[PDB]
Structure formats: structure tokens, C-alpha cells
Amino acid sequence: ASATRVIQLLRNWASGRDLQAKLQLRYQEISKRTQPPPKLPVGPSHKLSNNYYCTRDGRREAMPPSIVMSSQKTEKKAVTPAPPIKRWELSKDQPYL
Template identity: 45%
Template sequence: MTVIKKIVPPIQHTDSAPFIKFLLNLLMRFKRYKQNGEFVRDGYVNCLRYADEISSRSLPPPTLPCGINRKISHNYYYDRDARRSVQPPRLIGEDVLQLTSAKKDRKNAFISLPYPVPGVGYAWKRDASEELKQTKYDPSLKELERFDAK
């Protein structure tokens, strides 16, 4: 008994309609010369990539050396992973409540916070002798001098 092999036709990829293909070949002719000087007209080159024309990208499994780095749980990167240090959000109001609820000393009524608080500025006095001519005689700046530190 003879075995008949069927020849499988190549896969038909989706492409432009024949009229569109004709227009592309007509309007988008790429002109080039071969190295021997022969003039060649390349028609429209389809830039689409199809799965059956592309080689597989399967990589071989890595060859790891035996030792402590073979297991992820014993790797030192396991301890440095930032995802394990995430905690629920902390309420900012808890620190303020602790400061206000603490017993206040009569001598030290001012509570100083351990970090700088926005809104407290640098006290400075304007010295017009060191300024340029544009700002030295400016009436609006002269008016603002009353807010300078004394």
C-alpha cells in the first residue's frame, strides 16, 4: 500500500485588495541600483510580520550554579525586596493628638516639633543701598518695608 502525501499549500496572509496593491506598486516605487549598475524597481514591500515567518523566542532554562543563590528564599535579595516593607498608611493626626494631649508644663508652654514647619519665614531687613536702581527707588517696595523685622 502506498502512502500519498498531501502537499499543504502555503498559508495565505491577509493583504491589501488587488486594486490597492496595484496603486501601492504604481505610486510607491522604490528606485535603487545594484552594485553592477543595473537599475531595479522594487515595488511595495509589505512590512507586516506573520507568526509563521518568525522564529520562536523560547529561551533555554538558565544554568544556575549550586549554592545559596539557587533558592530565591535564601537569596539576599529576598530581604531587600521593598514589597515586603509596605505597611498600611499612617495617620498624621495621631502625632498631633499625642502632642496636644500631653501634659503641658507651665514653664515651657511652647511645643517644638521635631521637624520644620512650613510658614515660618526668615526675618530680614531691606537694605536699599545694596540694590539695583530699578528696585532701589520702587515705591511699592518702599511701602512693604513696614513689614520688615525691626
């Protein structure tokens, strides 16, 4: 910035942290407003051969929902929608604040 040395000491002591390292204002450390022209890559389907759309058509592979039980139409174990969720583990980086 451009503050006086005494002002910098006062602001560092009042805040308790060195504010010169972390400045809210951007001083020439941002990217240039003018950048060189890019060259974007092509996707995986930009192939001149072996690229028939019938083999890579996501929409046409959709199906109507499968009927599991319909009213019109050895013991069995009880089942759940999914295996029970495993309990979370306390983080080792900083378990408590």
C-alpha cells in the first residue's frame, strides 16, 4: 500500500495480525486484462472414423421404468432400501475448534 510506517505499526498492533501480507486491495498481482488468444481442445467424439452416433446415443438408451409388482397380475429374509450408513469418523485435521 502507501501508508506511513507509524500507521502500519498502529494498524498491525490494533488488529493483532500483520496486515501487509494480506491486503484487501489488489495491487498489480491480478492477471492482465488482455490475454493471449486461446486454443480450446476438442471432445472425445471429434473422430473421423469409428464414431457412429448409434453407439454413443445416451438418450436412446433410456428405458421405461421396470414394473416390479402389479396388482393386475421358503422363508424370505427382511430387506432394507440400502445397507445402513456407516458412522462418520471424527476429522483428524481439527476435531474441535
